[PDB]
Design a protein around this ligand. Sequence first.
Ligand code: NAG
Ligand code: NAG
Ligand code: NAG
Ligand code: NAG
Ligand code: NI
Ligand code: NI
Ligand code: ZN
Length: 348
Amino acid sequence: DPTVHWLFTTCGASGPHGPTQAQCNNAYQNSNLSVEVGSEGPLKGIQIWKVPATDTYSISGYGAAGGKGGKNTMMRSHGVSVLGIFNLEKDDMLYILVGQQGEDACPSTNQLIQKVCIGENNVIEEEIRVNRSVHEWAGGGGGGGGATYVFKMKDGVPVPLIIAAGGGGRAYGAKTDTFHPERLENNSSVLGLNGNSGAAGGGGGWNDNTSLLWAGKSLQEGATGGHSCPQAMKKWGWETRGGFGGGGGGCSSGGGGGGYIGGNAASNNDPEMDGEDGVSFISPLGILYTPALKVMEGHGEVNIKHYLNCSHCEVDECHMDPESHKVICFCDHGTVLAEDGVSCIVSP
Ligand SMILES: *[C@@H]1O[C@H](CO)[C@@H](O)[C@H](O)[C@H]1NC(C)=O
Ligand SMILES: *[C@@H]1O[C@H](CO)[C@@H](O)[C@H](O)[C@H]1NC(C)=O
Ligand SMILES: *[C@@H]1O[C@H](CO)[C@@H](O)[C@H](O)[C@H]1NC(C)=O
Ligand SMILES: *[C@@H]1O[C@H](CO)[C@@H](O)[C@H](O)[C@H]1NC(C)=O
Ligand code: NI
Ligand code: NI
Ligand SMILES: [Zn+2]
């Protein structure tokens, strides 16, 4: 029977740059999936996937998380989840960027930075106490998480379909969350610009002119993660770079997360100001499944499958027979479908 499940990952790649063709070939080897990875220009690191047949598809993409801070090691800002149902034609070309996680501050392979991570270096803390702010020993806030982009080409112009925002960069010192909401855009005339970049870099938007090195670049520019603070270097070896997919570079403050509209970062290197999560987007073409919650940690991914309405099942996981079109609630992970037709149970 034909294949209905397709899972796109970072192909084992991490950082501000995307995966290679060899990385994705090795990742999808022996799996029922093959893509062509871009190697030059703004498509470098983006996976091109050929639609096998004209049908209805569920495109659910998850953004990447930001990087941990240095002092508190408080848990990351997770990525945004977006799920959409689209009508696609055979041989259509989907362009899929899988956002990569922003660089964690700790641990570090640099010996002096590691002394700051384990806490046996009080230079940053005594600089905040005495000098009242960080301008000398800056850095330590993780870079912004790269966003996940799934877009199309129509008459020679990129058309976005699903953009899952990237998580904001956790600042160096952070014992607070404030649980910001996750924005989502549907009307396309709203400009998908970058996030505001201060000392730390802002997130990369959909299409903008990124002029700052530490800022994450937009999707149509390559979506490369930004560098760290110029002051974070030349004093430390501190590199907290934004993830691939518009992730903003890191400073003592957190870098902004990429998305349709880049996440805004701190403007004056605030050691406690995290980076804002990016702005997600879904095309007017297509139906929204579940509002844009933030769930997954680590790298992002994209799950595309032949759309089936499995809402009657207890868990929304069901498959359809290709010939007889008999839909059955999919269970098997060690379980067997119960007598009520839904709600899988453990058999043996
Ligand atoms: C604050 O004062 C001066 C300003 O540059 C600087 O030399 C000093 O090292 C700073 N304080 C600390 C604790 O670093
Ligand atoms: C667009 O998204 C916003 C934020 O999720 C929502 O409030 C608004 O109703 C949406 N508009 C349409 C037409 O779906
Ligand atoms: C999108 O928003 C702009 C203003 O924000 C408005 O002028 C335009 O008509 C909107 N597009 C649609 C399709 O509603
Ligand atoms: C899925 O099927 C249910 C009935 O089981 C229906 O109420 C719902 O509107 C359907 N959803 C979609 C997106 O077709
Ligand atoms: Ni958030
Ligand atoms: Ni590094
Ligand atoms: Zn179908």
